[PDB]
Design goal:
The structure is cut from a larger assembly and holds seven protein chains of seven kinds.
Chain D (H helix, E strand, L loop, with lengths): L1 E3 L5 H12 L3 E8 L5 E7 L5 H8 L3
Antiparallel strand pairs in D: 1-3, 2-3
Chain F lengths: L5 H12 L33
Chain G lengths: L8 H24 L6 H18 L9 E11 L22 E10 L2 E10 L12 H18 L6 H14 L3 E2 L3 E6 L9 E4 L3 H6 L9 E10 L14 E4 L10 H13 L14 H10 L3 E4 L10 E10 L5 E2 L19 H8 L3
Antiparallel strand pairs in G: 1-2, 2-3, 3-10, 4-7, 5-6, 5-7, 7-10, 8-9, 10-11
Classes of the chains: A alpha+beta, B mainly alpha, C mainly alpha, D alpha+beta, E alpha+beta, F mainly alpha, G alpha+beta.
Bound molecules: magnesium ion (MG) (13 copies).
One magnesium ion binds next to strand 5 of chain A.
Chain E binds one RNA strand through helix 2 and helix 3.
Organism (chain C): Homo sapiens
Function (chain C): Component of the large ribosomal subunit. The ribosome is a large ribonucleoprotein complex responsible for the synthesis of proteins in the cell.
Subcellular location (chain C): Cytoplasm
RNA sequence: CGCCGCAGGUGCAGAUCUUGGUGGUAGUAGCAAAUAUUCAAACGAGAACUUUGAAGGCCGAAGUGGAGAAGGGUUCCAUGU
């Protein structure tokens, strides 16, 4: 299917993709930027640490109201969080990409996340009930994710 | 093995009513087989017998 | 797995409340097999379902 | 247990069962189902067995 | 060895100090579980039901000041689990807590 | 209510019977264009006319 | 783990007498089946002879159960198999020259011995049977000889299937679509290891790949039609049922519970027949089958004017040679065909004997 | 579609314009009325919330109990997802 940023050579690369994944787009975009360029082993260890709240993702663009943490100093930042659902969804996509690499026959101990992108999926509509007989939206903000891993050691 | 209007027309009221009764007991048996599973052949005979009853009653009337 | 039906049936058979129905925590699979009031009666006879005693409200202090 | 026409009453149900099954019946209870079909519980006479009558009907 | 068992006494009063009334007994079991993780070094800590009944014995806010427990590190016997060992903490009824040391105990 | 007339009960019977999904073989008919029963009614969402 | 295998001498000998008792009752059936006989009468006498023979056998040990592993199934000229009428069902009289398909199984100590054979009743002396019927029985027997030769540990279960398809194409006929042979062990008739006959897309992708293994029994089945191989039902009561011990359900019917207990007492897991009871039996069976405690063995009809033949038999797989315990009386001298086999590989397998 | 004529419901930034879609706000306000949960186990890919057992509590008979009228109309009951 059409990925943006097709790999430089599609022989040492593997792809993974998800659509209409019900995670917050803003949280997943920050998590994806954190693991971008990481080795696949480093990214798996880091994403598990985010779930355990031992390492945080820095919230750089979608940081309105995001609190401060000591682990954001690892990055050059001040605000960070531990999006558990984003980390789990990216761990599933990393396992899928890793299995795809084995199907292509290329070793997975040298894979590096060279491309990762979070797009906005179509919104899902729910309702909330307000003070004077009014209805306001309760939209979900799902996201598409695509990633490309390429070998380099 | 079917019934047609043209060869029903020479018959008398008694044997027309008897043929109506036999079709009615068969239709009731088919409705029994419908609610007890039955078979596709038995289910498809329901329309055939229903049209036969209409055919006899039309000729009678 | 889920014994919501069996607790309800046992309380009706035993003519007590669901408070007083004791289903054996170890014989969960056997009790889950009971989907009829007569099966419930068999488990009650076999001791897998027990009617618990009334919580004590003594009148000794009042007397 | 039969599904019957919603217009038929207990007397008509009693006579209809007696004729087209050649059995004697004791009493007929009748309700109308939530989907609109009338249902008749036709108790048979003591000397008639509902088991083998349902066998010759074909609904066993 | 890693199948060691030891008897401890925990100052519940020390670890519960300052907690609100409706949280005192729930926090006592969180502190008992945290105590067992520290002393035996196993994330998998299983509170015995007698021990839970002892902590809640006087209600939700009047938790006992001291409790005498026994930690038993044992093999998980489920190698499919990520933990090789778990600590089973049980309740040791005592008449007094004076002069009670942490003691290694036999089987 | 428990107390109901025969007309009310018969009206409720028809409303119940037509509150079912479309058969799956409808979707394979030539020139179908029908996806699902758009006249589905839930008892809590939309109240009946009567 | 607790299953009993054929490595023991006593298990070997009781298979030999299990197929011996199966062969003599099938032989008695073939001789007794003639013009003007009742299928119900054949089923009851074939069953009765089994009961008295399996009762008088091993008079010094009266503890282990013995009995029927599959009821006598007599299907004639319009039914595929799994056919055994009750007393209420109208009988079938045997006309002249009818081809009949007889199925029969008997189990000892839980191990079964299943035999089946197709033959034509009342073969006149000095005549030769000719027609489109001539090829279907002969090709089916050539399938039995082929499977007898090629049953061996290492010959895959698929090689059985396309071999039967090949000889069927040689005779310009087709087998019945999706018929199922089984691998047999103790106290089962529906083992997971299975052989499909004349598959399609659905069957081939739900079927499994397996390699023949030593010390196990094979109830292999050839079943070929002279038409299209398709089958359905025509509103006929299903009689043969078998208890599935995998699942259970709380029966809410007193008559169904009594019927299910009698099934467990007599035919605990092997298939049975409704003739072995009747008024209450046909009452309890439906509410047992509704919750899938009994698996129905429905009757299958082809179109009118078609003729279908079958053979099946249990072959023990023993390393240095497999032996056919149960065999049917087929003689090619009194039965010819208008088309033959023209493949050299088929010539090689028939000429080489085990 | 060009050219010669003919004819218009013929040119948009506005109208607190109409309909549709989308932003910043913003991962923000918020998910704070009626005291309260805890331990173990089972099923399950997954358990703060399901089920069972054990505790500790609440409603406290003018009940958070057991039944009805009106109204609802299948919400009842099993099984499965
Ligand atoms: Mg701000
Ligand atoms: Mg704030
Ligand atoms: Mg609101
Ligand atoms: Mg309002
Ligand atoms: Mg009434
Ligand atoms: Mg409302
Ligand atoms: Mg205009
Ligand atoms: Mg505009
Ligand atoms: Mg907030
Ligand atoms: Mg709040
Ligand atoms: Mg109180
Ligand atoms: Mg009330
Ligand atoms: Mg409900």
């Amino acid at each position: 299917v059409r990925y943006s940023l097709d790999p430089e050579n599609p022989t040492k690369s593997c792809k993974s993709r998800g659509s209409n994944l019900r995670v917050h787009f803003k949280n997943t975009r920050e998590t994806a930027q954190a693991i971008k360029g990481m080795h696949i082993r480093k990214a798996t260890k880091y994403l598990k640490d985010v779930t355990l709240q031992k390492q945080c993702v820095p919230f750089r663009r979608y940081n309105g109201g995001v609190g401060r943490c000591a682990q954001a100093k690892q990055w050059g930042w001040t605000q960070g969080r531990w999006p558990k659902k984003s980390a789990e969804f990216l761990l599933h996509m990393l396992k899928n990409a890793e299995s795809n690499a084995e199907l292509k026959g290329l070793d997975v101990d040298s894979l590096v996340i060279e491309h990762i992108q979070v797009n906005k999926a179509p919104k899902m509509r729910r309702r909330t009930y307000r003070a004077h007989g009014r209805i306001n939206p309760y939209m979900s903000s799902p996201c598409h994710i695509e990633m490309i891993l390429t070998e380099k050691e | 093995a079917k019934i047609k209007a043209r060869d029903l027309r020479g018959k008398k009221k008694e044997e027309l009513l008897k043929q109506l009764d036999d079709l009615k007991v068969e239709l009731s048996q088919l409705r029994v087989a419908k609610v007890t599973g039955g078979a596709a052949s038995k289910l498809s005979k329901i329309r055939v017998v229903r049209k036969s009853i209409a055919r006899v009653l039309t000729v009678i009337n | 797995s889920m014994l919501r039906l069996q607790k309800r049936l046992a309380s009706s058979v035993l003519r007590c409340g669901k408070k007083k129905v004791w289903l054996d925590p170890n014989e969960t699979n056997e009790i889950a097999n009971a989907n009829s009031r007569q099966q419930i009666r068999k488990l009650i006879k076999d001791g897998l379902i027990i009617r618990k005693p009334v919580t004590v409200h003594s009148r000794a202090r009042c007397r | 247990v039969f599904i019957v026409d919603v217009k038929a009453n207990k007397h008509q149900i009693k006579q209809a069962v007696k004729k087209l099954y050649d059995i004697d019946v004791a009493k007929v209870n009748t309700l109308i189902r939530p989907d609109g079909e009338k249902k008749a519980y036709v108790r048979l006479a003591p000397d008639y067995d509902a088991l083998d009558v349902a066998n010759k009907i074909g609904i066993i | 060895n890693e199948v060691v068992t030891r008897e401890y006494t925990i100052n519940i009063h020390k670890r519960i100090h300052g907690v609100g009334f409706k949280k005192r007994a729930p926090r006592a079991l969180k502190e008992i579980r945290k105590f067992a993780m520290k002393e035996m070094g196993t994330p998998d800590v299983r509170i015995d039901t007698r021990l839970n009944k002892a902590v809640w014995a006087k209600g939700i806010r009047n938790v006992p000041y001291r409790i005498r427990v026994r930690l038993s590190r044992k093999r998980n016997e489920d190698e499919d689990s990520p933990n090789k060992l778990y600590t089973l903490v049980t309740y040791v009824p005592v008449t007094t807590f004076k002069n009670l040391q942490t003691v290694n105990v036999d089987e | 209510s428990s107390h109901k007339t025969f007309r009310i009960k018969r009206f409720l019977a028809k409303k119940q019977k037509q509150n079912r999904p479309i058969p799956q073989w409808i979707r394979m008919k030539t020139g179908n264009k029908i996806r699902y029963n758009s006249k589905r009614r839930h008892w809590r969402r939309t109240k009946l006319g009567l | 783990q607790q299953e009993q295998t054929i490595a023991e001498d006593l298990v070997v000998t009781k298979y030999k007498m299990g197929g011996d008792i199966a062969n003599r009752v099938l032989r008695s059936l073939v001789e007794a089946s003639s013009s003007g006989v009742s299928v119900l009468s054949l089923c009851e006498k074939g069953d009765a002879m089994i009961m008295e023979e399996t009762g008088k056998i091993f008079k010094k040990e009266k503890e282990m159960k013995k009995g029927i592993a599959f009821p006598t199934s007599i299907s004639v000229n319009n039914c595929v198999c799994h056919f055994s009428p009750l007393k209420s069902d109208q009988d079938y009289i045997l006309k002249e020259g009818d081809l009949v398909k007889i199925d029969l199984g008997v189990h000892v100590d839980g191990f079964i011995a299943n035999v089946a054979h197709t033959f034509v009743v009342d073969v006149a002396q000095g005549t030769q049977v000719t027609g489109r019927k001539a090829d279907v029985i002969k090709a089916a027997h050539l399938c039995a000889e082929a499977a007898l030769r090629l049953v061996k540990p290492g010959n895959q279960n698929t090689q059985v299937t396309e071999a039967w398809n090949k000889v069927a194409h040689s005779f310009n006929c087709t087998p019945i679509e999706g018929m199922l042979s089984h691998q047999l062990k103790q106290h089962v008739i529906d083992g997971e290891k299975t052989i499909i006959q004349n598959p399609t897309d659905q069957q081939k992708k739900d079927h499994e790949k397996a390699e023949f293994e030593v010390h196990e029994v094979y109830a292999v089945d050839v079943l070929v039609s002279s038409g299209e191989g398709k089958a359905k039902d025509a509103g006929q009561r299903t009689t043969i049922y078998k208890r599935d011990p995998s699942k259970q359900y709380g029966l809410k019917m007193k008559t169904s519970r009594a019927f299910f207990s009698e099934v467990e007492r007599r035919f605990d897991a092997m298939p049975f027949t409704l003739r072995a009871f009747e008024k209450k039996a046909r009452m309890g069976v439906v509410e047992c089958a509704k919750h899938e405690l009994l698996q129905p063995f429905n009757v299958l009809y082809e179109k009118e004017g078609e003729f279908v033949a079958q053979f099946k038999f249990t072959v023990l797989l023993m390393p240095n040679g497999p032996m056919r315990i149960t065999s049917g009386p087929f003689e090619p001298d009194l039965y010819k065909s208008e088309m033959e086999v023209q493949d050299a590989e088929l010539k090689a397998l028939l000429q080489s004997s085990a």
